[model samples]
Target chain A: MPPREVHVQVTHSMPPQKIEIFKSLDNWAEENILVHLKPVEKCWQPQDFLPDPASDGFDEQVRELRERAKEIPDDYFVVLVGDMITEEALPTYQTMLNTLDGVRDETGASPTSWAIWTRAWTAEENRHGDLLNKYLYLSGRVDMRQIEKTIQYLIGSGMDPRTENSPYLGFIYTSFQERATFISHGNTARQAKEHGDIKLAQICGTIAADEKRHETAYTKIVEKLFEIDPDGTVLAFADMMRKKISMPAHLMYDGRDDNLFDHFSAVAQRLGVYTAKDYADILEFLVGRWKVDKLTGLSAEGQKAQDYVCRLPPRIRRLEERAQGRAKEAPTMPFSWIFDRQVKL
Target chain B: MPPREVHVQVTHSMPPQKIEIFKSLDNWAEENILVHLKPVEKCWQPQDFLPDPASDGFDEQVRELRERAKEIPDDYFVVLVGDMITEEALPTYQTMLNTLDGVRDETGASPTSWAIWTRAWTAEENRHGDLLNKYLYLSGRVDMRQIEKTIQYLIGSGMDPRTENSPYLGFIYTSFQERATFISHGNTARQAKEHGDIKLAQICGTIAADEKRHETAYTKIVEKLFEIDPDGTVLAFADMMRKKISMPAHLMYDGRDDNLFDHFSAVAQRLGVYTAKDYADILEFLVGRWKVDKLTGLSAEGQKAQDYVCRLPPRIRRLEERAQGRAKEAPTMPFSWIFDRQVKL
Candidate 1:
């Protein structure tokens, strides 16, 4: 038998006091959950947007859907496929939330505010993958087998948001990441419209709307944390930014590409779906939303964190500008998802 | 705002020794993972079984699928919807597994044996929901909106397996539950074949096969635990049985019916998709598989638990027989899923 696998212990445990602060917000989370998450009855189903197989005009509808799908460029398809695959890895994100201390959905059906929020948020997010997967399949553009395998690999491969199971770090990471997703999906929606695929545009628009709500909810969570524990919250926010809020789908892999996420990210960046500049913008937006510059009475360490966060966005933008200036003509790479067709950057 | 929601604390914590035993099995899990799980490249994709919209004959294939679907009864559709909705709540199950103390996927992409197993297991399970949901949508029999709403509600509502974050209790629960699901889906496949819906049968059959493999893996975990810590293992097995193995989808709601799961379960039972006798038989099968009667070196508590577990099947069988004798003609209920169609036992 091979040597026993080593179990690495988590090095940085969240302070007990910080965990208490997170636990204290549970009641607040419960009260505001409905405001943030729509009721199931009120929410739109994937079936609402897709062509119903039961419909008499189903064939024509599918044909039209495919025709419109054809109008989308290869770069758009790559980013869209990447986005859908990321959404399909919902189980990992949900599981990641539960791993956080203090705010766990203890019994899965726990009545805690954070627990309820997580489940409802997860439910809302589930529709994105369903709609997109169906849309892609019906469009008959991408390799379904390859796309399906990529989703399987992505889920099986899992992701690390680098929160280390700290609820404080978790909320901060989520706040930033949700906004990033919102920008990406919303941009995809706008691009879909540019391509004249109104049906695909509507599908993405609905998903983007959900992400926008989720982004607001998570941002609100961090804002509440700042109110309750300004020093800790700012420190967490800065620390996450310092460590970098990695994309939740950073570890995703297609079977053949070892650098699949990086490759897909290039396509997303090239198409203006999600870019480095967006990251700086989201950071700047969040810093303003939390009024990090306005936070007073912080400890020395907290003050240092605050200063770093306040100064970081402009520094990032400067670096982004420099990179853009240094940009060279990018080459194309074959994506197994697009039938080994080359997608140019 | 309404009064603050109560956050219930987990009362029963697993003993450190038992958790250590579970953690110790990590090496075994990693080493044996390949034996239990198929490689991503080798596993079947949902698209493999689904009709391709790109195909010229797509319409004809769908027509045949719907025609076959029409042959199946409303009761079957009710049960199938329930099963599919349950599967669609994959996020809940993945999160549930990580809530266990010893076996959490700490980093999400952790290299630990148990953590890897959870992700791969989740990946395999993900396909089941995808296949079933697409199949049901294509069949054009069930109300996709109502079904989608149920899925949304079910995932939002979440479930409590009563494991209390104990890996010992969790493995036992999964072992029993996986077998139950296998029986349910396997029976559904047989019934689908009887109704001449070969496509539906194939879908259920594939899902059932995965569940069967999972059941074996979990059962093996318990067996290994028994070899190492027989007393604790048997005690936990009995304790779980005493509490009764609740179905994972017990908390599912369909907006209209508060007793949606129970109603769906009744349909399943009436159709022999899953029955009381099957539960008893499962208990008997597990007892034999664990060699509960053969365990000799036990503490007084262990011996008592062993005796209780060994005697359980016969007692359950007796009750099942009495219930069958006392059975009366069941009334019908309108399922929102089947357009409020009344289904009778």
Candidate 2:
């Protein structure tokens, strides 16, 4: 028999009372509370929630954190953050708070309008930083001073959700971001174990679970955005993709004057954050899922953008071939020899 | 006897000339050229240099391109172009070619006539992407279609190097970007090996060699910047440290949003790249190398920044302690319980 399609009739839309109940439990705020509570409970009663930090077993903690930090590359963060914002699910409660703040700022309303949800999301986001920080400190994998500095940096420079203006742009950004996060977190978690940091690996795995859910939410948003405004959303996405988004420390971050592409490429490759293929995947998703070809109301500019996205595959192929041909011709100049010449001889 | 600080200065302060020459060598470019030209050279006995795509060994060809792509993060090209402008060498030949068309539209003429350098820098910057694209195509690591689309995106969006204006900001940015590049190249090389793409690994290693030099260049620049503007630089550095300088795709990158702190802590433990200790080392370099404490012309804001930098260590320690406390109290949440219940049902 052919594969059967099961279509369930929608019972009446969830009643307001049920929606409120569900909202209370499943809202961003509740999610945050749960996230925060986990770290608090786990750390507070180590004998129950976590392994003893004082014992030999605790050495695994140190090993895990060390391995994780060593293994995770920088490019992965961009992908991960994009995913979080795309998805509606709160990755951590803090993300929810950030979303609420954005909404509040945009709508000119107070967070109190969504106070309960915001509080929960804040709580959830808190756990992520807290748990990871704890693992790093107790295991002695990282310097307390530097870690604190990083924290201060994070707290001081608040997050701007990828979905700032257009919901469609936000959706696409989040979809790509979530996928990136899932891959990075999952890879790091496994690497930690391989490096003899089982505890760290476990923590990473748990976090990855949360990330997966976050990704789902963001992806849903992208799907929704596609339905509402395919042309506008596609154009915005293409534009964003084309522009080199700034990472932190664009100015004083590096004293050396370097090109943006070269600098970011090195960082991305070093961190294993995102790869050329990964970028390709983002384009593919837009083409396959958004169905830009089917959209109406596209202006000439929009059509041009859509065409670019559609033609990406061929462009990538040509570049790849050209790269291969060049590779066959000669070895590129090695940068190391210069350094050796400068310092050694 | 103490080891001497050997400084092997080149006759002409510019090294690009040597790099270019080396690129055209027998075991390098010449060998590949000979192979590709064998048919043409043998048949026509041509007197002039002719481009051939098949001259390099298959593996060599692929390795060169992959190596370049693997070495740097894509976002960093803008910065790399900038550095080339400042390097008192080679007259920014390549940069001028790549950037001349756009520099006037970007940064206006500066007091130092830095625009001259900027123009040259942009022109030279094009070579890397060109070479890399060709290499990726031949190697088959990337699809031509995808590459073309990405290039379109890159050109249309156009990366901006002046995201942050201050030189100190640039210093901090490079410090992290370099370390990030080093780690990423190392990882890619290893991964390529695991994927049984030895050629890709070799290419990555080659690119990594370039990255190492680039990294060294940036490191030196940061050190110098620290000396020239210690307070302002340090303040900027401090502020940067407090913010989340995410990878390009915050969500898409591995080990990003899910367990950011854990991954960072792991990085700190490895001592391979920018670690907590590395940050401290950089800070120390600033204080000791530049004698920030003794600088007389420092503004009050600069002094305050210096003081803040000095206090970073203790503050980090306190944060670590709190993190540890939180980790010890990890709490099992209702969500986990609910998921468990659903699984059982």
- Cα-based lDDT at residue B114, candidate 2: 28
Q: Which candidate is the best by DockQ?
A: 1
Each candidate: how many clashes? 0, 174
lDDT of 2 at A298: 83
What is the C-alpha local distance difference test score of each model? 0.83, 0.37
lDDT for model 2, please: 0.37
Q: After superposition, how far is residue A196 of candidate 2 from its true place, in Å?
A: 4.2
Q: After superposition, how far is residue A154 of candidate 1 from its true place, in Å?
A: 1.2
Instruction: Kindly give the stretch of ten consecutive residues in candidate 2 chain B with the minimal lDDT sum.
Output: B336-345
* Model 2 TM-score on a 0 to 1 scale: 0.34
RMSD of each: 3.1, 23.3
TM-score of chain B of 1: 0.95
The segments of candidate 2 whose C-alpha lies over 4 angstroms from its true place after superposition are A1-102, A105-122, A138-141, A150-164, A244-273, A293-299, A313-345, B1-345
**lDDT by residue for model 2 (A1-345), tens:** 111112222212212342242234344433433333222212221122233332445336434444455554323322222222222111111222222212211111112223322322232332343344334333322233322222222222222333333334444655565566566567656655775657656776776675666556555545545555566666766665564222222211011222322433343334444445555665566567667667777889888888877777557645533444322343222111011111100
Give the true-structure RMSD of model 2: 23.3
